[PDB]
Amino acid sequence: QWKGLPVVKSGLDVGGMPTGTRYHRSPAWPEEQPGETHAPAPFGSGDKRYTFSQTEMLVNGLKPYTEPTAGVPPQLLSRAVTHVRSYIETIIGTHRSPVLTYHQACELLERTTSCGPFVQGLKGDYWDEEQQQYTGVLANHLEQAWDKANKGIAPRNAYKLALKDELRPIEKNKAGKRRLLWGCDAATTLIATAAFKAVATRLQVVTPMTPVAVGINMDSVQMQVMNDSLKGGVLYCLDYSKWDSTQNPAVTAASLAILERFAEPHPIVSCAIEALSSPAEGYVNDIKFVTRGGLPSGMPFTSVVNSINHMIYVAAAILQAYESHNVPYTGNVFQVETIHTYGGGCMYSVCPATASIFHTVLANLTSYGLKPTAADKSDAIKPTNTPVFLKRTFTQTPHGIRALLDITSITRQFYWLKANRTSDPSSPPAFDRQARSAQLENALAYASQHGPVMFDTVRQIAIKTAQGEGLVLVNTNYDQALATYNAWFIGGTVPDPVG
Amino acid sequence: DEFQWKGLPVVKSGLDVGGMPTGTRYHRSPAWPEEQPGETHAPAPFGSGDKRYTFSQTEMLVNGLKPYTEPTAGVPPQLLSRAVTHVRSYIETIIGTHRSPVLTYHQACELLERTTSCGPFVQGLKGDYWDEEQQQYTGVLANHLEQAWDKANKGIAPRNAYKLALKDELRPIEKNKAGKRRLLWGCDAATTLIATAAFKAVATRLQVVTPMTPVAVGINMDSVQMQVMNDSLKGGVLYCLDYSKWDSTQNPAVTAASLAILERFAEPHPIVSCAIEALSSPAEGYVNDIKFVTRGGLPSGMPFTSVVNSINHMIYVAAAILQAYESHNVPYTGNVFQVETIHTYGGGCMYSVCPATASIFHTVLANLTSYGLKPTAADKSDAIKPTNTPVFLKRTFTQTPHGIRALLDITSITRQFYWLKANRTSDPSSPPAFDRQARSAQLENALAYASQHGPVMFDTVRQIAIKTAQGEGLVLVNTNYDQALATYNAWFIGGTVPDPVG
């Protein structure tokens, strides 16, 4: 059952996973529309849809984390790291950011999201609003971990395990796949937050100048800069498979070491590294699962850390194809090549030199343990002229270049609502009519950018939904959709010189 | 009707407007009675009052107006039209083909500058006709505006008219001797409104997408937008220029073209036709009983001056680059701004050109100069060679421990400590009736700027700031290096809209 997995008695009992899904078929769309390719992930017992045990998916999801991936040989890994290090040195400076205050890290914790495996409930449950600080059990828990970290004792890299309840593509549901959610211990998140938050900030402020695109505003001149940067290279757009489960511990350890060089030395930094770089321990019920490979989605700064991992990987891959054709590589990989990454989602715009051997770059990449494909699950990965990133398709429009949100991602928001957990996606959903309205006004503003043929498809669907759900929409008017989108845009720029 | 006046072609305006503002607002800081090592500037000559200089008020209004009589050689029509097509089609690719709808009367009115002169046919600032919450305007002004709006909606365009004055600022001493003050053209509010209704939507489209178009107007030099500019220079040979006397070397035919380019990106409508009609017309500047018509140039103070100016600059550099190529018998197939990298803020610019273009760049300059322009050589020492040190809008792009920054010119910084604005007066010497609150803000900022240069040379500005704070009886929190740094950082991180709002 749990046997043949690095499983052990945790000495606690954390409780089972939630049953059901928060997803309801809409009141206006009781029956599966043709073209719908997504449906809630499999939720165990109670969907007459498939016969899966929840705990089955868990263990299945967990198999990758059960042993390590090949990684990158330590000598090559080290060269790669100097490319990743020197490059970002040059855009965020050699400055070392001072660590955060206990109160400072605290108010940055996401209040809507679990305290992890040592304290039940969400973080928000223990926040005193009048005092503007955490209180009670959770407070005690943080204080002590904070205390031990100042003494150079690291916190435990522990997670409350669960499955993401979300919309997934149908084939993947049929297959019995579902994604893992690693709810990290509030203490560890705090320690990590205090250490790297200033570094992460600098990287985000500068996006997309650094291959670490986290927090990129896809609906601003930020996107235009990104698009612009692909000019005069061979474009490859990728979306690796199961990225997080394919990460190598020694690479994550390198990334953390890089993040570390931009933070000023402090016990808190040391424990942040010690913690996030040792094996993950996911709890469920009375047992824990100690990972032997992989990065848990839901570790602090997983997106930032993932992207630096990605830089490392791709730099190593390029440095290795040049070596086995006995050509030297002249300068910085991120100067010569142009890279944009967000976790396993990326765009590589490489120089003719590189592009010519791009075949062994992939061979090197897969050999490390990664699975590259082919955004547009395009079954075979080629150069392209159509940039695709974070489910957007860069497109010229009457307003200039826009990142078009994948139409399925848009339309699906009309057929399903996120609401109250239940075993019956066909039951009446309890929902906030005010908020649903806004949600769909957003969707329309987004569809507007697709041009009036595909917008009409959406308006049609929208009008019908608005009726069925008893909502009045505005952006159901095409001129309306455009202007709201545009205000978002203008929007994501700060004008006249500030000082 | 048309008589002379110390060399000036001028004509009775009918209406009186009265003379322009008496005196200067600049006093020399009580902590700095004696001139300081490397002080370059001082307040503009202002005549009536000024015991320093023996120029009159109406003397140097002539020295400012002098150029605008002699029209400039300009760009020959055939080159012009071609250069236009390069400019137009390039800004199409980064702002799209869409046509922006004209502003409604109230949006138009809302953006009219409230601190500012009323034009030459209406009295007082625009504020002396506005009441907070009643939505609109009142008085003679509301009438003036309302007519122009209907006359303009029926194709009858307003008048390209201005109330001439004299920009009171600190200018180089060498220039202040040569009788020079810079002119200020206060614009008839009615005209400033019609243009607004026509173009604000386009100007915004350009600004919001900065610096991806060589129209830098609006750029936040203290944000990532600067870092982008900096990257866009890598790979070219870099020339930095700030052109001498830009506004008065502008060519009516160039200006006209720019405006049609602007028009291309607005939906066609009487309001638009009108603004173009007015703005390409010769400008005339009323000062009391007389007025002066321009036979060439640009009034510094026409609505959208910087935007239009910068589109002008695109045309000039494109035409001159494309001319150079012709005279070397080398084909030039691409669009100018995809091949070369340009940034312009009216007069000041940075050219990052490809090697081929660099090798014939002398002759580029020769072309520009031949259209009646006067290029220098931004960094005070000219020629006028390729640099590695980007300079633009008083900023030198420099690697720092916090990544690249546009460092404010130090002499631009330390100067703020030696002088202060306040009350109109005949002296820059006498004790001022100034506002400690505003002054304190200004210096704190100056410090926040100086901190980007690093500790050694920041400390010299601290030195200055201490001594300044004593003579002036102030307290300056950014006298601490970390505070200045913190307040800079505040600005800079606050210049980038993150966790995907949309």
Q: What is the 3-state secondary structure (H, E, C) of A126-178?
A: HEECCCCEECHHHHHHHHHHHHHHHCCCCCCCEEEEEECCCEEEHHHHHCCCC
A497 and B403: CB-CB below 8 Å? no
The answer to whether A316 and A84 have CB atoms below 8 angstroms apart is no
C-alpha to C-alpha distances, A391 to A448, B114, B219, nearest whole angstrom: 16, 45, 30
Of the CA atoms within 13 Å of residue A168, those in its CB half-sphere come to: 19
Give A434→chain B minimum CA distance, Å. Answer: 18
C-alpha to C-alpha distances, B37 to B418, B420, B459, B463, nearest whole angstrom: 12, 19, 16, 14
The answer to whether B296 and B70 have CB atoms below 8 angstroms apart is yes
Return d(Cα A212, Cα A203) in angstroms, integer: 7
Best mutation target, B100, B213, B228, to test chain A (most A CBs within 10 A): B228
Query: Contacts of residue A399 in chain B, CB cutoff 8 Å?
Result: 95-96, 98
Sign, Cα dihedral of B391, B394, B400, B405: negative
DSSP secondary structure of B195-215: HHHHHHHHHHHHHTTTTSSSB
What count of other Cβ atoms lies within 10 Å of the Cβ of residue A497? Answer: 18
Q: Does B402 touch chain A (CB under 8 A)?
A: yes
Return d(Cα A116, Cα A425) in angstroms, integer: 28
Return d(Cα A339, Cα A358) in angstroms, integer: 14
Torsion angle (degrees, nearest 10) of CA B123, B126, B128, B129: 100
Query: Contacts of residue A93 in chain B, CB cutoff 8 Å?
Result: 399-403
Instruction: State the pairing for strand pair B170-172/B290-293.
Output: unpaired
A93 and B501: CB-CB below 8 Å? no
Sign, Cα dihedral of A49, A51, A55, A61: negative
Query: Contacts of residue A396 in chain B, CB cutoff 8 Å?
Result: 93, 96
Q: Does B327 touch chain A (CB under 8 A)?
A: no
Give, as one character, the DSSP assignment of residue A99.
P
Give A42→chain B minimum CA distance, Å. Answer: 29
Return d(Cα B188, Cα B196) in angstroms, integer: 12
The H or E element containing residue B3 is: strand B2-3
Return d(Cα B71, Cα B313) in angstroms, integer: 17
The answer to whether A155 and A134 have CB atoms below 8 angstroms apart is no
B223 and A495: CB-CB below 8 Å? no
Q: Does B204 touch chain A (CB under 8 A)?
A: yes
Q: In sequence order, what are the beta bridge partners of A128? A: A133
The answer to whether B44 and B181 have CB atoms below 8 angstroms apart is yes
Return d(Cα B502, Cα A219) in angstroms, integer: 7
Q: Does A139 touch chain B (CB under 8 A)?
A: no
When CB atoms are compared, the residue of A209, A493, A497 closest to B231 is A209
B252-264 and B305-326 helices, crossing angle to 10°: 110
Q: State whether residue B399 is helix, strand or coil.
A: coil
Q: Does B8 touch chain A (CB under 8 A)?
A: no
What count of other Cβ atoms lies within 10 Å of the Cβ of residue B283? Answer: 25
Q: Does A478 touch chain B (CB under 8 A)?
A: no
Structure-token pair, residue B215: 């129209």
Structure-token pair, residue B91: 């800004």
- Say if domain B216-251+301-389 classifies as CATH 3.30.450.90: no
What count of other Cβ atoms lies within 10 Å of the Cβ of residue A356? Answer: 12
Q: Side by side, which strands form the sheet with B341-345? A: B237-242, B348-353, B341-345
DSSP secondary structure of A187-208: HHHHHHHHHHHHHHHHHHHTTT
When CB atoms are compared, the residue of A95, A202, A217 closest to B501 is A217
Structure-token pair, residue A103: 């109160």
What count of other Cβ atoms lies within 10 Å of the Cβ of residue B334? Answer: 10
Of the CA atoms within 13 Å of residue B433, those in its CB half-sphere come to: 4
A206 and B227: CB-CB below 8 Å? yes
Residue in A closest to B441 by C-alpha: A499
Residue ranges matching CATH 3.30.70.270 in chain B: 216-251+301-389
Question: What's the Rg (C-alpha) of chain B?
Answer: 24
The answer to whether A204 and A182 have CB atoms below 8 angstroms apart is no
Query: Contacts of residue B231 in chain A, CB cutoff 8 Å?
Result: 209
Q: Does B495 touch chain A (CB under 8 A)?
A: yes
Residue in A closest to B496 by C-alpha: A205
Interface of A with B in 72-131 (CB under 8 A): 90-95
Query: Contacts of residue A398 in chain B, CB cutoff 8 Å?
Result: 96-98
Best mutation target, B204, B220, B453, to test chain A (most A CBs within 10 A): B220
Q: In sequence order, what are the beta bridge partners of A160? A: A183, A283
Per the listing, tokens 């990965």 go with A381
Q: In sequence order, what are the beta bridge partners of A237? A: A347
Query: Contacts of residue B403 in chain A, CB cutoff 8 Å?
Result: 90-93, 202, 206
Q: In sequence order, what are the beta bridge partners of B398? A: B405
Cβ contacts of A378-384, under 8 Å, gap ≥ 24: A381/A236, A381/A238, A382/A236, A383/A234, A383/A235, A383/A236, A383/A355, A384/A235, A384/A236, A384/A237
Counting one residue from chain A and one from chain B, the pairs whose CB atoms sit within 8 A come to 125
Query: Contacts of residue B225 in chain A, CB cutoff 8 Å?
Result: 493
Q: Does A487 touch chain B (CB under 8 A)?
A: no
Q: Does B493 touch chain A (CB under 8 A)?
A: yes
- Say if domain A213-248+298-386 classifies as CATH 3.40.50.2300: no
Return d(Cα B182, Cα A483) in angstroms, integer: 41
Q: Does B448 touch chain A (CB under 8 A)?
A: yes
The answer to whether B80 and B87 have CB atoms below 8 angstroms apart is no
Residue ranges matching CATH 1.20.960.20 in chain B: 390-502
Query: Contacts of residue B97 in chain A, CB cutoff 8 Å?
Result: 398
What count of other Cβ atoms lies within 10 Å of the Cβ of residue A72? Answer: 27
Return d(Cα B305, Cα B217) in angstroms, integer: 10
Cβ contacts of A451-457, under 8 Å, gap ≥ 24: A451/A397, A452/A478, A454/A407, A455/A481, A457/A407, A457/A411
Whether the bond into A401 is cis, omega within 30 of 0: no
Of the CA atoms within 13 Å of residue A385, those in its CB half-sphere come to: 1
Residue in A closest to B231 by C-alpha: A209
Query: Contacts of residue A340 in chain B, CB cutoff 8 Å?
Result: none
What count of other Cβ atoms lies within 10 Å of the Cβ of residue B385? Answer: 10
According to CATH, what is the number of the domain B21-76? 6.10.250.3230
Best mutation target, B200, B212, B413, B485, to test chain A (most A CBs within 10 A): B212
Return d(Cα A162, Cα B48) in angstroms, integer: 82
According to CATH, what is the number of the domain A387-499? 1.20.960.20
| Residue B285, phi then psi, degrees to nearest 5 | -110, 105
B498 and A399: CB-CB below 8 Å? no
Give A306→chain B minimum CA distance, Å. Answer: 17
Q: Does B486 touch chain A (CB under 8 A)?
A: no
Sign, Cα dihedral of B86, B88, B92, B95: positive
Give A209→chain B minimum CA distance, Å. Answer: 8
Q: Does B224 touch chain A (CB under 8 A)?
A: yes
Return d(Cα B218, Cα A490) in angstroms, integer: 12
CATH fold group of domain B390-502: Mitochondrial Import Receptor Subunit Tom20; Chain A (1.20.960)
| Residue A396, phi then psi, degrees to nearest 5 | -75, 135
Query: Contacts of residue A331 in chain B, CB cutoff 8 Å?
Result: none
Sign, Cα dihedral of B69, B75, B76, B77: negative
According to CATH, what is the number of the domain A18-73? 6.10.250.3230
| Residue B155, phi then psi, degrees to nearest 5 | 80, -15
Return d(Cα B372, Cα B361) in angstroms, integer: 17
A288 closest CA partner among A2, A25, A9, A4: A9
User: Looking at A318-408, which runs of residues are DSSP E strands?
Assistant: 338-342, 345-350, 388-389, 392-397, 400-405
Return d(Cα A177, Cα B48) in angstroms, integer: 86
Return d(Cα B99, Cα A481) in angstroms, integer: 17
Per the listing, tokens 């109250």 go with A420
Query: Contacts of residue A489 in chain B, CB cutoff 8 Å?
Result: 208
A415 closest CA partner among A434, A449, A435, A440: A440
Residue ranges matching CATH 6.10.250.3230 in chain B: 21-76
When CB atoms are compared, the residue of A205, A496, A499 closest to B493 is A205
Three-point CA angle A3, A6, A8, nearest 5°: 80
B502 and A488: CB-CB below 8 Å? yes
Query: Contacts of residue B399 in chain A, CB cutoff 8 Å?
Result: 90, 93
A117 closest CA partner among A279, A281, A283, A298: A283
Resolution as reported, in Å: 3.0
B502 and A201: CB-CB below 8 Å? no
Return d(Cα B58, Cα B4) in angstroms, integer: 14
Residue in B closest to A445 by C-alpha: B502
What totals of helices (H) and strands (E) does chain A contain, helices first?
Answer: 18, 17
What count of other Cβ atoms lies within 10 Å of the Cβ of residue B375? Answer: 21
